[PDB]
Amino acid sequence: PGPPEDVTIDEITDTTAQLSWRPGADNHSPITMYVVQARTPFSVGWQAVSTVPEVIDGKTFTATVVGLNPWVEYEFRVVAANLIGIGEPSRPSENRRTEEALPEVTPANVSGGGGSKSELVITWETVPEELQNGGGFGYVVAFRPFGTISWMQAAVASPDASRYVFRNESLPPFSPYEVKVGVANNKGAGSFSPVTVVYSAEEEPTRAPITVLARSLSATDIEISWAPPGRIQGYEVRCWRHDEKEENARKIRTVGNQTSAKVTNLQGNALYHLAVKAYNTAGTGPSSAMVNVTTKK
C-alpha cells in the first residue's frame, strides 16, 4: 500500500473536525482501512484519534475526527492499510486551530504573602496553553478580609501571569485574607480554585521601647534592659563610644521575648551611648530614648 493524498480540513468545531482525502498508490491488493493521526504542539510525534465512522473502510473518504482539544493547532494525516501491510502515511494537512470553548481547569497552588508596605501578594501556578481553551485567556483574583462578606475581583489579563499585588493605604498590617483565583477566556468564565488564606504584608514596629535601663558590669561589659510598649520578633540595641560617630555603632539583636541584653568587649573607663529599637521582618521600629553609661575602671 502507498500514501494517500489531498488531506484537507473541510470544517472544524471546538471538539471535532471534518476531513477529506483522496486515495493514492495501493500497490496491488485493495485498500481495506484508513486511519487518522493528529499532531499538536503538545504531542510527541503523531497520535491516533477517534473518528466517526468509528472505523473507516476503504470505500469511505470523509470522516469526522472527535474528541479534539479546544483552541489548539492540529495537524492531521491519513494512513492506508492493505491486506499485505500498513501503507505509508500521507503528507500532513495544513495546520488549523480548533474553535473556542470555556476553560475548565483552575490554577494550582494558590498561595502568597510578603511584599512592601500596604500590599497583599497573591500567587498561583500558570495554566498551560493547551488547557486555556480559548484566546483572551486571563485570571480572576477574588479576595476579602477574613470574616467579611463582599469580595473584590481583580482581572489579570495576562495568561502567562502567576502573581497579583493589591496596594491600598487602608490595609491593615499582616492581616488574613480569603483568596481564590479563577480563569476566563473569550467564551466566558471558568470556575474558581479552592479558597485559601493569604496574609498581607508586614510593617516595621510603630512604637519604641520604653524605660530603658543601663548599668556597667565591668570595664568591658554593660547591661541594658527595657519594656515592651503588631508583631515584634525582638530588639536591636546599638552602642557607640562618645568619640566615635553613631553611624558605626556596635549592634546586637534580641531574639525572643527577653527584654534585656549585655554589651561586651568594651573599653575601660569609657562613656558609651546606647538605645534599643524593636524589629520585625520588615525592619527596625523607632529608637527608644538614649542612655549613657561609663564603664568601671
PDB file of C-alpha atoms in Angstrom:
ATOM      1  CA  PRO A   1       0.000   0.000   0.000  1.00  0.00           C
ATOM      2  CA  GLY A   2       1.000   3.620  -0.532  1.00  0.00           C
ATOM      3  CA  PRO A   3       0.407   7.184   0.676  1.00  0.00           C
ATOM      4  CA  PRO A   4      -2.980   8.865   0.287  1.00  0.00           C
ATOM      5  CA  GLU A   5      -3.120  12.470  -0.902  1.00  0.00           C
ATOM      6  CA  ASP A   6      -5.052  15.744  -0.706  1.00  0.00           C
ATOM      7  CA  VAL A   7      -5.805  15.780   3.013  1.00  0.00           C
ATOM      8  CA  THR A   8      -7.957  18.774   3.940  1.00  0.00           C
ATOM      9  CA  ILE A   9      -9.854  20.110   6.944  1.00  0.00           C
ATOM     10  CA  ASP A  10     -13.295  20.866   5.499  1.00  0.00           C
ATOM     11  CA  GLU A  11     -14.939  22.108   8.704  1.00  0.00           C
ATOM     12  CA  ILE A  12     -13.772  22.381  12.306  1.00  0.00           C
ATOM     13  CA  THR A  13     -15.559  22.826  15.662  1.00  0.00           C
ATOM     14  CA  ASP A  14     -14.407  23.180  19.281  1.00  0.00           C
ATOM     15  CA  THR A  15     -14.021  19.396  19.660  1.00  0.00           C
ATOM     16  CA  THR A  16     -14.492  17.953  16.117  1.00  0.00           C
ATOM     17  CA  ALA A  17     -13.150  18.385  12.586  1.00  0.00           C
ATOM     18  CA  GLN A  18     -14.279  17.084   9.175  1.00  0.00           C
ATOM     19  CA  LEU A  19     -11.585  15.549   6.993  1.00  0.00           C
ATOM     20  CA  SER A  20     -11.407  14.608   3.334  1.00  0.00           C
ATOM     21  CA  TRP A  21      -8.747  12.666   1.443  1.00  0.00           C
ATOM     22  CA  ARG A  22      -8.294  11.073  -1.973  1.00  0.00           C
ATOM     23  CA  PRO A  23      -6.722   7.608  -2.406  1.00  0.00           C
ATOM     24  CA  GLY A  24      -3.272   7.051  -3.843  1.00  0.00           C
ATOM     25  CA  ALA A  25      -0.977   4.159  -4.626  1.00  0.00           C
ATOM     26  CA  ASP A  26      -2.451   0.924  -3.313  1.00  0.00           C
ATOM     27  CA  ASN A  27       0.154  -1.478  -4.742  1.00  0.00           C
ATOM     28  CA  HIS A  28      -1.939  -4.383  -5.960  1.00  0.00           C
ATOM     29  CA  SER A  29      -4.207  -5.662  -3.194  1.00  0.00           C
ATOM     30  CA  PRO A  30      -7.224  -3.491  -2.318  1.00  0.00           C
ATOM     31  CA  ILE A  31      -7.364  -0.873   0.421  1.00  0.00           C
ATOM     32  CA  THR A  32      -9.278  -2.175   3.435  1.00  0.00           C
ATOM     33  CA  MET A  33      -8.809   0.532   6.069  1.00  0.00           C
ATOM     34  CA  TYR A  34      -7.995   4.199   6.634  1.00  0.00           C
ATOM     35  CA  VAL A  35      -6.785   5.680   9.943  1.00  0.00           C
ATOM     36  CA  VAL A  36      -6.311   9.302  11.000  1.00  0.00           C
ATOM     37  CA  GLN A  37      -3.389  10.576  13.090  1.00  0.00           C
ATOM     38  CA  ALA A  38      -3.018  14.034  14.621  1.00  0.00           C
ATOM     39  CA  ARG A  39      -0.138  16.222  15.760  1.00  0.00           C
ATOM     40  CA  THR A  40      -0.078  19.160  18.193  1.00  0.00           C
ATOM     41  CA  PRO A  41       2.449  21.406  19.955  1.00  0.00           C
ATOM     42  CA  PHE A  42       1.957  19.056  22.959  1.00  0.00           C
ATOM     43  CA  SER A  43       2.120  15.728  21.074  1.00  0.00           C
ATOM     44  CA  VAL A  44       5.235  13.571  20.911  1.00  0.00           C
ATOM     45  CA  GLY A  45       5.029  12.756  17.221  1.00  0.00           C
ATOM     46  CA  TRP A  46       1.818  11.643  15.551  1.00  0.00           C
ATOM     47  CA  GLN A  47      -1.005  10.455  17.810  1.00  0.00           C
ATOM     48  CA  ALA A  48      -4.067   8.386  16.979  1.00  0.00           C
ATOM     49  CA  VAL A  49      -7.563   9.878  17.142  1.00  0.00           C
ATOM     50  CA  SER A  50     -11.191   8.798  17.397  1.00  0.00           C
ATOM     51  CA  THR A  51     -13.287   9.068  14.251  1.00  0.00           C
ATOM     52  CA  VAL A  52     -16.883   8.866  13.093  1.00  0.00           C
ATOM     53  CA  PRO A  53     -17.332   6.405  11.487  1.00  0.00           C
ATOM     54  CA  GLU A  54     -15.623   4.510  14.274  1.00  0.00           C
ATOM     55  CA  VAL A  55     -13.732   2.557  11.587  1.00  0.00           C
ATOM     56  CA  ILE A  56     -13.032   3.967   8.119  1.00  0.00           C
ATOM     57  CA  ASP A  57     -13.295   1.311   5.408  1.00  0.00           C
ATOM     58  CA  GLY A  58     -11.543   1.547   2.050  1.00  0.00           C
ATOM     59  CA  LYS A  59     -14.787   2.765   0.441  1.00  0.00           C
ATOM     60  CA  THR A  60     -15.195   5.777   2.769  1.00  0.00           C
ATOM     61  CA  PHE A  61     -13.337   9.024   2.103  1.00  0.00           C
ATOM     62  CA  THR A  62     -14.623  11.572   4.644  1.00  0.00           C
ATOM     63  CA  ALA A  63     -14.911  11.263   8.406  1.00  0.00           C
ATOM     64  CA  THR A  64     -15.333  13.411  11.485  1.00  0.00           C
ATOM     65  CA  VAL A  65     -12.488  13.349  13.988  1.00  0.00           C
ATOM     66  CA  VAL A  66     -13.849  13.671  17.526  1.00  0.00           C
ATOM     67  CA  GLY A  67     -12.541  14.471  20.989  1.00  0.00           C
ATOM     68  CA  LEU A  68     -10.146  17.229  19.983  1.00  0.00           C
ATOM     69  CA  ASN A  69      -8.705  19.797  22.397  1.00  0.00           C
ATOM     70  CA  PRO A  70     -10.250  23.296  22.137  1.00  0.00           C
ATOM     71  CA  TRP A  71      -8.089  26.206  20.926  1.00  0.00           C
ATOM     72  CA  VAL A  72      -5.200  24.008  19.779  1.00  0.00           C
ATOM     73  CA  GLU A  73      -3.382  23.962  16.443  1.00  0.00           C
ATOM     74  CA  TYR A  74      -3.865  20.498  14.928  1.00  0.00           C
ATOM     75  CA  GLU A  75      -2.130  18.773  12.022  1.00  0.00           C
ATOM     76  CA  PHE A  76      -3.717  15.655  10.519  1.00  0.00           C
ATOM     77  CA  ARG A  77      -2.511  12.839   8.299  1.00  0.00           C
ATOM     78  CA  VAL A  78      -4.160   9.713   6.906  1.00  0.00           C
ATOM     79  CA  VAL A  79      -2.634   6.227   6.656  1.00  0.00           C
ATOM     80  CA  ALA A  80      -3.907   3.490   4.353  1.00  0.00           C
ATOM     81  CA  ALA A  81      -3.810  -0.208   5.205  1.00  0.00           C
ATOM     82  CA  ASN A  82      -3.702  -3.098   2.760  1.00  0.00           C
ATOM     83  CA  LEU A  83      -4.185  -6.813   3.322  1.00  0.00           C
ATOM     84  CA  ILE A  84      -0.408  -7.102   2.709  1.00  0.00           C
ATOM     85  CA  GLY A  85       0.617  -4.455   5.226  1.00  0.00           C
ATOM     86  CA  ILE A  86       0.384  -0.918   6.532  1.00  0.00           C
ATOM     87  CA  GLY A  87       0.920   1.804   3.954  1.00  0.00           C
ATOM     88  CA  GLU A  88       2.969   4.951   4.078  1.00  0.00           C
ATOM     89  CA  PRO A  89       1.421   7.994   5.785  1.00  0.00           C
ATOM     90  CA  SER A  90       0.104  10.872   3.744  1.00  0.00           C
ATOM     91  CA  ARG A  91       1.704  14.289   3.820  1.00  0.00           C
ATOM     92  CA  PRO A  92       0.311  16.429   6.658  1.00  0.00           C
ATOM     93  CA  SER A  93      -2.643  18.736   6.121  1.00  0.00           C
ATOM     94  CA  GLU A  94      -2.449  22.462   6.811  1.00  0.00           C
ATOM     95  CA  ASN A  95      -2.455  23.352  10.500  1.00  0.00           C
ATOM     96  CA  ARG A  96      -5.827  24.562  11.801  1.00  0.00           C
ATOM     97  CA  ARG A  97      -6.752  25.807  15.271  1.00  0.00           C
ATOM     98  CA  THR A  98      -9.874  24.400  16.892  1.00  0.00           C
ATOM     99  CA  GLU A  99     -12.713  26.715  17.893  1.00  0.00           C
ATOM    100  CA  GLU A 100     -13.003  28.308  21.327  1.00  0.00           C
ATOM    101  CA  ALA A 101     -14.574  26.753  24.398  1.00  0.00           C
ATOM    102  CA  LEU A 102     -14.950  27.654  28.043  1.00  0.00           C
ATOM    103  CA  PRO A 103     -11.940  26.981  30.266  1.00  0.00           C
ATOM    104  CA  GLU A 104     -12.411  24.115  32.695  1.00  0.00           C
ATOM    105  CA  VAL A 105      -9.193  23.977  34.748  1.00  0.00           C
ATOM    106  CA  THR A 106      -8.385  26.281  37.678  1.00  0.00           C
ATOM    107  CA  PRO A 107      -4.885  27.416  38.714  1.00  0.00           C
ATOM    108  CA  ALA A 108      -2.872  25.262  41.083  1.00  0.00           C
ATOM    109  CA  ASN A 109      -1.178  26.048  44.401  1.00  0.00           C
ATOM    110  CA  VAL A 110      -2.844  29.382  45.112  1.00  0.00           C
ATOM    111  CA  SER A 111      -0.773  30.996  47.876  1.00  0.00           C
ATOM    112  CA  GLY A 112       1.069  34.214  48.625  1.00  0.00           C
ATOM    113  CA  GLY A 113       2.344  36.684  51.199  1.00  0.00           C
ATOM    114  CA  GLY A 114       5.209  39.060  51.661  1.00  0.00           C
ATOM    115  CA  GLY A 115       5.690  42.340  49.861  1.00  0.00           C
ATOM    116  CA  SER A 116       6.243  46.008  50.578  1.00  0.00           C
ATOM    117  CA  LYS A 117       4.217  48.199  52.927  1.00  0.00           C
ATOM    118  CA  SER A 118       0.428  48.256  52.484  1.00  0.00           C
ATOM    119  CA  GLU A 119       0.486  45.407  49.937  1.00  0.00           C
ATOM    120  CA  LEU A 120      -1.165  41.998  49.519  1.00  0.00           C
ATOM    121  CA  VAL A 121       0.592  39.382  47.380  1.00  0.00           C
ATOM    122  CA  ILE A 122      -1.274  36.529  45.698  1.00  0.00           C
ATOM    123  CA  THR A 123       0.423  33.773  43.682  1.00  0.00           C
ATOM    124  CA  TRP A 124      -0.662  30.729  41.653  1.00  0.00           C
ATOM    125  CA  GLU A 125       0.708  28.371  39.021  1.00  0.00           C
ATOM    126  CA  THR A 126       0.076  29.482  35.451  1.00  0.00           C
ATOM    127  CA  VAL A 127      -2.433  27.437  33.449  1.00  0.00           C
ATOM    128  CA  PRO A 128      -0.836  25.897  30.337  1.00  0.00           C
ATOM    129  CA  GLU A 129      -1.875  26.942  26.854  1.00  0.00           C
ATOM    130  CA  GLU A 130      -3.386  23.586  25.843  1.00  0.00           C
ATOM    131  CA  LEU A 131      -5.877  23.900  28.724  1.00  0.00           C
ATOM    132  CA  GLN A 132      -6.641  27.616  28.245  1.00  0.00           C
ATOM    133  CA  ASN A 133      -9.188  26.541  25.605  1.00  0.00           C
ATOM    134  CA  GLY A 134      -9.557  29.989  24.145  1.00  0.00           C
ATOM    135  CA  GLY A 135      -7.971  33.222  23.238  1.00  0.00           C
ATOM    136  CA  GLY A 136      -8.175  36.157  25.571  1.00  0.00           C
ATOM    137  CA  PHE A 137      -7.303  33.877  28.456  1.00  0.00           C
ATOM    138  CA  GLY A 138      -6.861  35.543  31.834  1.00  0.00           C
ATOM    139  CA  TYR A 139      -7.142  35.090  35.582  1.00  0.00           C
ATOM    140  CA  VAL A 140      -9.701  36.379  38.101  1.00  0.00           C
ATOM    141  CA  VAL A 141      -8.375  37.041  41.606  1.00  0.00           C
ATOM    142  CA  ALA A 142     -11.057  37.250  44.273  1.00  0.00           C
ATOM    143  CA  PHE A 143     -10.169  38.208  47.815  1.00  0.00           C
ATOM    144  CA  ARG A 144     -11.701  39.552  51.031  1.00  0.00           C
ATOM    145  CA  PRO A 145     -10.596  40.078  54.658  1.00  0.00           C
ATOM    146  CA  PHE A 146     -11.291  37.117  56.936  1.00  0.00           C
ATOM    147  CA  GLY A 147     -14.783  37.337  58.391  1.00  0.00           C
ATOM    148  CA  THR A 148     -16.171  39.836  55.865  1.00  0.00           C
ATOM    149  CA  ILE A 149     -18.824  39.302  53.174  1.00  0.00           C
ATOM    150  CA  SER A 150     -18.233  41.267  49.952  1.00  0.00           C
ATOM    151  CA  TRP A 151     -15.492  40.194  47.600  1.00  0.00           C
ATOM    152  CA  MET A 152     -13.043  42.118  45.451  1.00  0.00           C
ATOM    153  CA  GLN A 153     -12.269  40.821  41.967  1.00  0.00           C
ATOM    154  CA  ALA A 154      -9.206  41.920  40.015  1.00  0.00           C
ATOM    155  CA  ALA A 155      -8.746  40.787  36.423  1.00  0.00           C
ATOM    156  CA  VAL A 156      -5.228  39.718  35.439  1.00  0.00           C
ATOM    157  CA  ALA A 157      -5.423  39.726  31.657  1.00  0.00           C
ATOM    158  CA  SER A 158      -2.019  38.114  31.023  1.00  0.00           C
ATOM    159  CA  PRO A 159      -2.247  34.334  30.500  1.00  0.00           C
ATOM    160  CA  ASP A 160       1.417  33.901  31.458  1.00  0.00           C
ATOM    161  CA  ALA A 161       0.917  35.675  34.809  1.00  0.00           C
ATOM    162  CA  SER A 162       1.453  33.980  38.168  1.00  0.00           C
ATOM    163  CA  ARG A 163       1.246  36.827  40.695  1.00  0.00           C
ATOM    164  CA  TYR A 164      -1.058  39.672  41.730  1.00  0.00           C
ATOM    165  CA  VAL A 165      -0.429  42.502  44.196  1.00  0.00           C
ATOM    166  CA  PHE A 166      -3.090  44.727  45.773  1.00  0.00           C
ATOM    167  CA  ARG A 167      -1.982  48.040  47.262  1.00  0.00           C
ATOM    168  CA  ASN A 168      -4.069  50.380  49.410  1.00  0.00           C
ATOM    169  CA  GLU A 169      -3.130  52.588  52.361  1.00  0.00           C
ATOM    170  CA  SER A 170      -6.157  51.500  54.415  1.00  0.00           C
ATOM    171  CA  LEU A 171      -4.771  47.961  54.507  1.00  0.00           C
ATOM    172  CA  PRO A 172      -4.227  46.522  57.993  1.00  0.00           C
ATOM    173  CA  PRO A 173      -0.751  45.078  58.636  1.00  0.00           C
ATOM    174  CA  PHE A 174      -0.162  41.301  58.469  1.00  0.00           C
ATOM    175  CA  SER A 175      -3.890  40.607  58.240  1.00  0.00           C
ATOM    176  CA  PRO A 176      -5.595  37.462  56.948  1.00  0.00           C
ATOM    177  CA  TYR A 177      -7.292  37.334  53.558  1.00  0.00           C
ATOM    178  CA  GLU A 178      -9.534  34.777  51.948  1.00  0.00           C
ATOM    179  CA  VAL A 179      -8.243  34.365  48.381  1.00  0.00           C
ATOM    180  CA  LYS A 180      -9.444  32.350  45.403  1.00  0.00           C
ATOM    181  CA  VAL A 181      -8.482  32.678  41.733  1.00  0.00           C
ATOM    182  CA  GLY A 182     -10.303  31.724  38.555  1.00  0.00           C
ATOM    183  CA  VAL A 183      -9.923  31.601  34.787  1.00  0.00           C
ATOM    184  CA  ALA A 184     -11.763  33.157  31.847  1.00  0.00           C
ATOM    185  CA  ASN A 185     -11.322  33.391  28.074  1.00  0.00           C
ATOM    186  CA  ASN A 186     -13.314  34.946  25.253  1.00  0.00           C
ATOM    187  CA  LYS A 187     -16.170  32.448  25.503  1.00  0.00           C
ATOM    188  CA  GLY A 188     -16.763  33.305  29.151  1.00  0.00           C
ATOM    189  CA  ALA A 189     -15.604  32.375  32.623  1.00  0.00           C
ATOM    190  CA  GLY A 190     -14.338  29.247  34.326  1.00  0.00           C
ATOM    191  CA  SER A 191     -14.744  28.062  37.887  1.00  0.00           C
ATOM    192  CA  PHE A 192     -12.629  29.046  40.879  1.00  0.00           C
ATOM    193  CA  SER A 193      -9.823  27.391  42.779  1.00  0.00           C
ATOM    194  CA  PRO A 194     -10.482  26.384  46.391  1.00  0.00           C
ATOM    195  CA  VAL A 195     -10.331  29.181  48.929  1.00  0.00           C
ATOM    196  CA  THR A 196      -7.037  29.601  50.734  1.00  0.00           C
ATOM    197  CA  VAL A 197      -5.858  32.175  53.274  1.00  0.00           C
ATOM    198  CA  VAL A 198      -3.067  34.642  52.489  1.00  0.00           C
ATOM    199  CA  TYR A 199      -1.676  37.181  54.965  1.00  0.00           C
ATOM    200  CA  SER A 200      -0.982  40.741  53.903  1.00  0.00           C
ATOM    201  CA  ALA A 201       2.441  42.340  54.070  1.00  0.00           C
ATOM    202  CA  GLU A 202       4.026  43.267  57.378  1.00  0.00           C
ATOM    203  CA  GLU A 203       5.276  46.680  58.509  1.00  0.00           C
ATOM    204  CA  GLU A 204       8.070  47.539  60.926  1.00  0.00           C
ATOM    205  CA  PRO A 205       7.071  48.206  64.557  1.00  0.00           C
ATOM    206  CA  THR A 206       5.339  51.512  65.173  1.00  0.00           C
ATOM    207  CA  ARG A 207       6.211  52.216  68.837  1.00  0.00           C
ATOM    208  CA  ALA A 208       9.582  52.439  70.542  1.00  0.00           C
ATOM    209  CA  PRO A 209      10.767  50.594  73.672  1.00  0.00           C
ATOM    210  CA  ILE A 210      10.147  52.367  76.962  1.00  0.00           C
ATOM    211  CA  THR A 211      12.016  52.817  80.263  1.00  0.00           C
ATOM    212  CA  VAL A 212      15.485  51.826  79.108  1.00  0.00           C
ATOM    213  CA  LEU A 213      17.870  50.957  81.969  1.00  0.00           C
ATOM    214  CA  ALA A 214      21.626  50.577  81.735  1.00  0.00           C
ATOM    215  CA  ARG A 215      24.424  49.813  84.188  1.00  0.00           C
ATOM    216  CA  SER A 216      28.083  48.935  83.833  1.00  0.00           C
ATOM    217  CA  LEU A 217      29.067  45.434  84.967  1.00  0.00           C
ATOM    218  CA  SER A 218      32.847  45.687  84.447  1.00  0.00           C
ATOM    219  CA  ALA A 219      35.447  47.562  82.402  1.00  0.00           C
ATOM    220  CA  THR A 220      34.210  45.710  79.292  1.00  0.00           C
ATOM    221  CA  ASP A 221      30.532  44.848  79.959  1.00  0.00           C
ATOM    222  CA  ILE A 222      27.288  46.859  80.035  1.00  0.00           C
ATOM    223  CA  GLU A 223      23.837  45.502  80.918  1.00  0.00           C
ATOM    224  CA  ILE A 224      20.749  47.111  79.424  1.00  0.00           C
ATOM    225  CA  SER A 225      17.025  46.444  79.829  1.00  0.00           C
ATOM    226  CA  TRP A 226      13.691  47.837  78.645  1.00  0.00           C
ATOM    227  CA  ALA A 227       9.935  47.178  78.470  1.00  0.00           C
ATOM    228  CA  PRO A 228       7.619  46.482  75.514  1.00  0.00           C
ATOM    229  CA  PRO A 229       5.060  49.235  74.753  1.00  0.00           C
ATOM    230  CA  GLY A 230       1.523  44.431  65.965  1.00  0.00           C
ATOM    231  CA  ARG A 231       4.218  41.739  65.872  1.00  0.00           C
ATOM    232  CA  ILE A 232       7.712  42.022  67.408  1.00  0.00           C
ATOM    233  CA  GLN A 233      10.371  39.338  66.950  1.00  0.00           C
ATOM    234  CA  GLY A 234      12.969  41.021  69.163  1.00  0.00           C
ATOM    235  CA  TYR A 235      15.003  44.144  69.825  1.00  0.00           C
ATOM    236  CA  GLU A 236      18.104  45.735  68.286  1.00  0.00           C
ATOM    237  CA  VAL A 237      20.247  47.647  70.775  1.00  0.00           C
ATOM    238  CA  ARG A 238      23.114  49.734  69.384  1.00  0.00           C
ATOM    239  CA  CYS A 239      26.060  51.109  71.291  1.00  0.00           C
ATOM    240  CA  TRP A 240      28.847  53.516  70.314  1.00  0.00           C
ATOM    241  CA  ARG A 241      31.566  55.340  72.211  1.00  0.00           C
ATOM    242  CA  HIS A 242      31.358  59.078  72.779  1.00  0.00           C
ATOM    243  CA  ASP A 243      34.296  59.910  70.487  1.00  0.00           C
ATOM    244  CA  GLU A 244      33.011  57.653  67.706  1.00  0.00           C
ATOM    245  CA  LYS A 245      30.159  58.582  65.389  1.00  0.00           C
ATOM    246  CA  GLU A 246      26.753  56.947  65.759  1.00  0.00           C
ATOM    247  CA  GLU A 247      26.984  55.626  62.174  1.00  0.00           C
ATOM    248  CA  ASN A 248      29.453  52.970  63.327  1.00  0.00           C
ATOM    249  CA  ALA A 249      27.647  51.605  66.351  1.00  0.00           C
ATOM    250  CA  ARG A 250      28.102  48.056  67.588  1.00  0.00           C
ATOM    251  CA  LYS A 251      24.661  46.491  67.133  1.00  0.00           C
ATOM    252  CA  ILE A 252      23.418  43.206  68.566  1.00  0.00           C
ATOM    253  CA  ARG A 253      19.906  41.816  68.301  1.00  0.00           C
ATOM    254  CA  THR A 254      17.484  40.152  70.695  1.00  0.00           C
ATOM    255  CA  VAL A 255      15.642  37.014  69.629  1.00  0.00           C
ATOM    256  CA  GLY A 256      12.628  36.175  71.732  1.00  0.00           C
ATOM    257  CA  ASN A 257      10.617  37.819  74.466  1.00  0.00           C
ATOM    258  CA  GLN A 258      13.691  38.759  76.538  1.00  0.00           C
ATOM    259  CA  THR A 259      13.792  42.472  77.373  1.00  0.00           C
ATOM    260  CA  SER A 260      17.493  42.794  78.220  1.00  0.00           C
ATOM    261  CA  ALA A 261      20.965  42.135  76.818  1.00  0.00           C
ATOM    262  CA  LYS A 262      24.663  42.532  77.634  1.00  0.00           C
ATOM    263  CA  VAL A 263      27.125  44.527  75.514  1.00  0.00           C
ATOM    264  CA  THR A 264      30.643  43.135  75.881  1.00  0.00           C
ATOM    265  CA  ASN A 265      34.186  43.764  74.623  1.00  0.00           C
ATOM    266  CA  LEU A 266      34.101  47.446  75.559  1.00  0.00           C
ATOM    267  CA  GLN A 267      36.851  49.793  76.701  1.00  0.00           C
ATOM    268  CA  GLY A 268      37.522  50.501  80.351  1.00  0.00           C
ATOM    269  CA  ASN A 269      36.582  53.832  81.915  1.00  0.00           C
ATOM    270  CA  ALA A 270      34.832  54.987  78.742  1.00  0.00           C
ATOM    271  CA  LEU A 271      31.488  56.701  78.156  1.00  0.00           C
ATOM    272  CA  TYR A 272      29.085  54.817  75.909  1.00  0.00           C
ATOM    273  CA  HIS A 273      25.716  55.691  74.380  1.00  0.00           C
ATOM    274  CA  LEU A 274      23.033  53.028  73.995  1.00  0.00           C
ATOM    275  CA  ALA A 275      19.489  52.772  72.680  1.00  0.00           C
ATOM    276  CA  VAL A 276      17.197  49.922  71.615  1.00  0.00           C
ATOM    277  CA  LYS A 277      14.719  49.577  68.712  1.00  0.00           C
ATOM    278  CA  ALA A 278      12.020  46.983  68.131  1.00  0.00           C
ATOM    279  CA  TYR A 279      12.232  44.962  64.913  1.00  0.00           C
ATOM    280  CA  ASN A 280      10.254  42.521  62.774  1.00  0.00           C
ATOM    281  CA  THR A 281      10.994  41.114  59.322  1.00  0.00           C
ATOM    282  CA  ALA A 282      10.060  44.465  57.768  1.00  0.00           C
ATOM    283  CA  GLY A 283      12.790  46.403  59.588  1.00  0.00           C
ATOM    284  CA  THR A 284      13.582  48.316  62.760  1.00  0.00           C
ATOM    285  CA  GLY A 285      10.993  50.411  64.527  1.00  0.00           C
ATOM    286  CA  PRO A 286      11.603  53.711  66.265  1.00  0.00           C
ATOM    287  CA  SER A 287      14.512  54.100  68.638  1.00  0.00           C
ATOM    288  CA  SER A 288      13.975  54.256  72.367  1.00  0.00           C
ATOM    289  CA  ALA A 289      15.405  57.149  74.312  1.00  0.00           C
ATOM    290  CA  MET A 290      19.155  57.205  74.691  1.00  0.00           C
ATOM    291  CA  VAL A 291      21.014  56.144  77.880  1.00  0.00           C
ATOM    292  CA  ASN A 292      24.547  56.983  78.941  1.00  0.00           C
ATOM    293  CA  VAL A 293      26.857  54.720  80.940  1.00  0.00           C
ATOM    294  CA  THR A 294      30.550  54.870  81.798  1.00  0.00           C
ATOM    295  CA  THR A 295      32.300  51.556  82.351  1.00  0.00           C
ATOM    296  CA  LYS A 296      34.144  50.684  85.535  1.00  0.00           C
ATOM    297  CA  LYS A 297      37.886  51.251  85.922  1.00  0.00           C
TER     298      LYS A 297
END
